[PDB]
Amino acid sequence: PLPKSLKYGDTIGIYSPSSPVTYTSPKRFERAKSYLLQKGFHILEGSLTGRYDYYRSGSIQERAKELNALIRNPNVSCIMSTIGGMNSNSLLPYIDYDAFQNNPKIMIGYSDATALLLGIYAKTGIPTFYGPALVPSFGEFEPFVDDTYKYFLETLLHDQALPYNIKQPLFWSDESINWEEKTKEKELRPNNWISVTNGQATGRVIGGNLNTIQGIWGSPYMPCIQEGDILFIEDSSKDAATIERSFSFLKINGVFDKVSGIILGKHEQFDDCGTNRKPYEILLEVLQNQRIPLLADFDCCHTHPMITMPIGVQVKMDATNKTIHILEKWKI
Amino acid sequence: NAMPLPKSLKYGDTIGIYSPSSPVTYTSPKRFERAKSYLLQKGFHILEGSLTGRYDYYRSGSIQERAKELNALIRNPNVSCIMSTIGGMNSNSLLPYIDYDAFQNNPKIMIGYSDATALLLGIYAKTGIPTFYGPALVPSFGEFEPFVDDTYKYFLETLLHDQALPYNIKQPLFWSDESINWEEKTKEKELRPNNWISVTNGQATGRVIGGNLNTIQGIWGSPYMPCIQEGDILFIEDSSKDAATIERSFSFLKINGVFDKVSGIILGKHEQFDDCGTNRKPYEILLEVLQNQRIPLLADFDCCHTHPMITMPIGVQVKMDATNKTIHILEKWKI
Numbered sequence: 305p306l307p308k309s310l311k312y313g314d315t316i317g318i319y320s321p322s323s324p325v326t327y328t329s330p331k332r333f334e335r336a337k338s339y340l341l342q343k344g345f346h347i348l349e350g351s352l353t354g355r356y357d358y359y360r361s362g363s364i365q366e367r368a369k370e371l372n373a374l375i376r377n378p379n380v381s382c383i384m385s386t387i388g389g390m391n392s393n394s395l396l397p398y399i400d401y402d403a404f405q406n407n408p409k410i411m412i413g414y415s416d417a418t419a420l421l422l423g424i425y426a427k428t429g430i431p432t433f434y435g436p437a438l439v440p441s442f443g444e445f446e447p448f449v450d451d452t453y454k455y456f457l458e459t460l461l462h463d464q465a466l467p468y469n470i471k472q473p474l475f476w477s478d479e480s481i482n483w484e485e486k487t488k489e490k491e492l493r494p495n496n497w498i499s500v501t502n503g504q505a506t507g508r509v510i511g512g513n514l515n516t517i518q519g520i521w522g523s524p525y526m527p528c529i530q531e532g533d534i535l536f537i538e539d540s541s542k543d544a545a546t547i548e549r550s551f552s553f554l555k556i557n558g559v560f561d562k563v564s565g566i567i568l569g570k571h572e573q574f575d576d577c578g579t580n581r582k583p584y585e586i587l588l589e590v591l592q593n594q595r596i597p598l599l600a601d602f603d604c605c606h607t608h609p610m611i612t613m614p615i616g617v618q619v620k621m622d623a624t625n626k627t628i629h630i631l632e633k634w635k636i
Numbered sequence: 637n638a639m640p641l642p643k644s645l646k647y648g649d650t651i652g653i654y655s656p657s658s659p660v661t662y663t664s665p666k667r668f669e670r671a672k673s674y675l676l677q678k679g680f681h682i683l684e685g686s687l688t689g690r691y692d693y694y695r696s697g698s699i700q701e702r703a704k705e706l707n708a709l710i711r712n713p714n715v716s717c718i719m720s721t722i723g724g725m726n727s728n729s730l731l732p733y734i735d736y737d738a739f740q741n742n743p744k745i746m747i748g749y750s751d752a753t754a755l756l757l758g759i760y761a762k763t764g765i766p767t768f769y770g771p772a773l774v775p776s777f778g779e780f781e782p783f784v785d786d787t788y789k790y791f792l793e794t795l796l797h798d799q800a801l802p803y804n805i806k807q808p809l810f811w812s813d814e815s816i817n818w819e820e821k822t823k824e825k826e827l828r829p830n831n832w833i834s835v836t837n838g839q840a841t842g843r844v845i846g847g848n849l850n851t852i853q854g855i856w857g858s859p860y861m862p863c864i865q866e867g868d869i870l871f872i873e874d875s876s877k878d879a880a881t882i883e884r885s886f887s888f889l890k891i892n893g894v895f896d897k898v899s900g901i902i903l904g905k906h907e908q909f910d911d912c913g914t915n916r917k918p919y920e921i922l923l924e925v926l927q928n929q930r931i932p933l934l935a936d937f938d939c940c941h942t943h944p945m946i947t948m949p950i951g952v953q954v955k956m957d958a959t960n961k962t963i964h965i966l967e968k969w970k971i
């Protein structure tokens with residue numbers, strides 16, 4: 305049960321399940337739309353576009369109805385979050401899962417939108433996409449926006465023969481600049497994926513933004529983690545204390561006794577609290593010498609550029625050799 | 637029916653202290669020395685855990701080092717009460733390494749709050765022995781007069797004094813959440829006239845489960861979180877969070893069916909709440925999450941980060957009267 309590939313000419317429906325970014329960052333919003341329109345995609349603005357309710361776009365009900373309208377719209381190929389936030393999980397009881405299951409569509413975003421990507425996967429079994437959100441990902445200036453775009457086409461639009469190899473970008477940035485307007489130019493940081501623990505795993509990939517997962521854990525909206533799953537996790541803009549708590553949360557729930565491997569994203573603007581420790585090192589301490597293949601600094605996270613990763617499908621990861629391959633169809 | 641219970645606390649008892657997360661014994665020495673002195677004066681003895689004075693940036697020590705500190709207190713038969721120095725983020729790291737069997741064969745008063753919730757609930761969930769949402773040494777007993785005396789009174793009344801049941805938990809007359817007077821006193825905190833808030837009318841009776849909501853999201857689903865059962869009274873508090881964060885947490889409960897099981901909610905005050913401009917109160921955000929579901933709710937309960945602090949047993953039957961703003965403990969928490 306799979307969504308149709310994106311085509312030029314298709315309509316991307318956009319919704320704001322948490323922060324009211326289309327209100328507070330209008331320039332980046334307009335740039336992001338223009339970028340996609342120039343590429344050849346239409347943008348249907350969700351009913352809360354341009355609305356402001358302080359920390360959020362609107363009420364729980366109104367946010368549900370904004371997304372639902374998109375889900376129920378036959379004219380919309382792809383559904384994309386404008387931005388993350390804290391509050392996607394509020395929507396979960398009210399989403400029209402059956403409407404989605406009866407007419408599957410591409411569901412894309414990241415960060416707080418993990419609540420919905422995972423919820424829709426758990427309820428319908430249809431793969432969803434950890435990938436660009438319209439404002440942060442496509443409002444980005446050159447050069448990085450073009451790399452993210454290349455990855456978005458690779459996953460959603462291109463014919464891809466299986467296995468589909470996910471390649472590492474040459475450069476990245478987590479630099480906190482050029483939000484609304486460009487001033488200076490982002491440092492090209494030279495890229496590497498890190499072989500933290502050597503080895504290989506294949507199995508169904510599950511995860512997204514770990515902080516956000518903690519807001520849906522235990523519910524019907526969190527897909528049950530199974531023996532042999534590959535855990536994919538990322539966090540942004542947290543400190544060492546926060547990610548230790550999240551790693552231990554995983555440990556004590558028995559997650560690391562089930563997963564065959566771990567893909568850890570880069571951590572945008574990580575605050576190491578003076579320790580000079582890297583996020584994977586904190587994870588290693590939690591793992592206590594449990595030998596799970598661990599590939600870190602994967603470029604599907606809040607750093608630019610961003611890969612678009614299908615969730616809920618068979619993946620093969622080789623930590624030693626730093627490869628990610630998607631083994632099963634995630635689209636039509 | 638009857639169940640294991642920790643011995644009441646007695647004057648002269650040793651209180652074991654440990655730092656399962658933030659290194660407050662290093663970073664706030666004057667509050668720490670003053671908190672020690674406050675309890676020493678009252679007649680108690682403090683046994684300082686192996687990581688007292690130590691500094692590992694955001695934490696007191698490594699996971700293993702911190703498990704070691706707490707386990708030595710648990711195994712020490714001369715310790716009557718085990719009290720965290722302060723919270724943080726990282727208590728939940730210790731849970732796979734705690735000696736639950738030794739706690740269980742010499743149960744002690746386990747007390748603290750905030751991040752220590754992972755430990756308080758972890759020990760209850762593993763051993764069935766009630767633990768206590770109450771003072772942590774540094775924030776609670778390092779508090780300057782007058783509030784520290786109120787906190788101390790509740791601590792004594794609940795843990796040392798003999799109490800007939802039902803045990804009425806009196807509303808504190810005054811409170812503050814002001815952030816002054818941490819290491820040293822620059823002026824008097826405001827004595828704010830206090831009130832509990834009858835958010836939604838009605839009564840509930842059942843086992844009280846909860847603590848620091850944010851912390852609970854660190855242990856949720858694990859063997860260390862007790863399963864919420866039909867009839868429970870949920871007790872929750874948070875501190876120094878914004879509206880976005882709490883809505884997430886409330887939604888987290890909602891989507892887990894928690895509000896379908898609980899007979900009532902006790903919500904603590906929220907220290908230094910950031911409403912993000914909405915002018916909304918934390919219970920107003922909870923209520924939206926509740927939607928059309930009616931649940932008796934008593935809010936601004938003084939078992940939280942605000943001063944002063946009530947000591948509340950966890951895992952025991954309570955009656956909460958939201959309409960009349962009363963809380964009674966209905967079954968023994970100590971012997």
Ligand SMILES: Nc1ncnc2c1ncn2[C@@H]1O[C@H](COP(=O)(O)O)[C@@H](O)[C@H]1O
Nearest residue numbers: 387388389414415416440483540541606
């Ligand atoms: N006001 C801002 N200034 C600069 N970057 C921002 C701002 N708001 C959001 N962002 C960026 O976009 C991300 C928003 O992602 P999230 O809120 O986690 O979906 C942040 O981590 C930043 O990378």
Ligand SMILES: Nc1ncnc2c1ncn2[C@@H]1O[C@H](COP(=O)(O)O)[C@@H](O)[C@H]1O
Nearest residue numbers: 722723724749750751775815818875941
């Ligand atoms: N530097 C400080 N200034 C004022 N209050 C503090 C300071 N450090 C800790 N606190 C108080 O100590 C409480 C305990 O922290 P925690 O147990 O981590 O939630 C915090 O909520 C504050 O009430």
